Design goal:
Enzyme class: hydrolase
EC number: 3.1.26.5
Keywords: Endonuclease, Hydrolase, Nuclease, RNA-binding, tRNA processing
Strand content: 15-25%
Radius of gyration: 13 Å
CATH class: Alpha Beta
GO molecular function, one term: ribonuclease P activity
Subunit structure: Consists of a catalytic RNA component (M1 or rnpB) and a protein subunit.
Number of helices: 4
Strand order of the largest sheet: 1-2-4-3
Number of domains: 1
Bound molecules: magnesium ion
RNA sequence: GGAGAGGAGCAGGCGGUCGCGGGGGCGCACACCUGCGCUCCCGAGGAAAGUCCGGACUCUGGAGCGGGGUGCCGGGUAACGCCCGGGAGGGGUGACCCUCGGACAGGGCCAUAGAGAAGAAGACCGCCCGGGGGGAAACUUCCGGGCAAGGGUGGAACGGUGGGGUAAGAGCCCACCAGCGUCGGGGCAACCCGGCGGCUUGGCAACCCCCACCUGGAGCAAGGCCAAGCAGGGGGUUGGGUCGCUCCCCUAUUCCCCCGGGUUGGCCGCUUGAGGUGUGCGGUAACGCACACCCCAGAUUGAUGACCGCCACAGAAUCCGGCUUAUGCUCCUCUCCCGUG
RNA sequence: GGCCAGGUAGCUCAGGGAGAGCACUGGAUAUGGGCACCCCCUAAGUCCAGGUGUCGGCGGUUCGAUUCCGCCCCUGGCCACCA
């Protein structure tokens, strides 16, 4: 859903500068009110996370978590998900349910 | 069965619940442009990779030189540094694998060790001949002369080993070998086979080079179009005109260089191509030709996931031809070895 | 996606027969200290002695490669339109 996909080239700077942030050991989540009746997701994966296979797997998991849980995630925010060094350190050791739990714990705390 | 060499295919599938990307069809709104909404088709790789080569395709005004690349020979191809076939040299018992022009066109470099390393250089331990001297003799000692044959030194010592010939010795002569010069035969050829013959005189060209062939430079962030928006200023014996050098077609600010500020939107390029698959024919083969069938990702923060159930390596970003590296199996050949019918 | 650089003692940096600087380990000795000297402890410093490496890895050429010729690994940078 590309209507659900927020542009990063223009908006990342604005969200970084004007928005809020939440984090845990695996993710940093940046967010800002978008003035819409729905939320939009963006993913920023640092080059150092790895090659296409690895980065694309992470992005797919994140997109899926967001899509399936859209109903419970707060509405009216532009959201940027950033994986942390730790995650890229035990990514192969971290299962899907753990990534889901850790990401949702942050997403559900987006206020207000 | 064991050990090993060559090579070909696949990339966990099929049946279920949801979620994407591009086309098509439809539901509709269309006073234009176009704007949404919901089923059929297709949807990452053998390496998509590293960016090591070769193109195709774009933009830079001409030519020459320099520079760079390839290196036995013959084909194949759009082309190549690739592939196929064949010839020498080497390794392995063997199937097989690895190597590749020229050092009497020239210049330069060979440390250390060693008597001596490019004109034929050299006498260290030594070998033999002719005298003077000492000494009973063995042996020593001085002068003159003859050796590259033994040993030592090396990565290599100016042909190798065996015999004859020598005072003692050398292709001095002879044998087989290696090299070179020729004559004759067979190959398009690289080169092979046989005969004759003085006796022959380092290595490195992944150092410059010589010979033969090939070659501008950038790269899809190439380049073309539209929309949006701020803010211009300082320079040019001229400089710049897609690497350098030298001759040459220009252009004078509108061009180029430096500093500063505006976008950091959308469309084209963007996928049908030296393109796959199935035969038939030619060719030792790589591969070519002929007909038929197919349309096989075109994203732009970048599309393939999760749960269930019987059994790796890693993700297109302009696209092809190859190389190299990373990696899980399965099958087909051939070689050697132990054991049996 | 493409185009370039660089990898050298622990760190910064030189350059076809492996070096400087910071630096580390010792010995010397207080004008520091147990008290005030004797005796002894500790070295910020100052003397001196050195300690030391797959040349980023793996192969080839060569008698020998930091230098030459190939691949692989790691660390950085550059590109688009407007005027
Ligand atoms: Mg059996
Ligand atoms: Mg690539
Ligand atoms: Mg890459
Ligand atoms: Mg000799
Ligand atoms: Mg440009």
């Amino acid at each position: 859903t590309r209507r659900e996909r927020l542009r990063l080239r223009r908006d990342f700077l604005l969200i970084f500068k004007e928005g809020k942030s939440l984090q845990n050991e695996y993710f940093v989540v940046l967010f800002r009110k978008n003035g819409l009746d729905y939320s939009r997701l963006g993913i920023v994966v640092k080059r150092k996370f790895g090659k296409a296979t690895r980065r694309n797997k992470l992005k797919r998991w994140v997109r899926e978590i967001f899509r399936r849980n859209k109903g419970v995630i707060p509405k009216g925010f532009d959201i940027v998900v950033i994986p942390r060094k730790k995650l890229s350190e035990e990514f192969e050791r971290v299962d899907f349910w753990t990534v889901r739990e850790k990401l949702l714990n942050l997403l559900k705390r987006i206020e207000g």
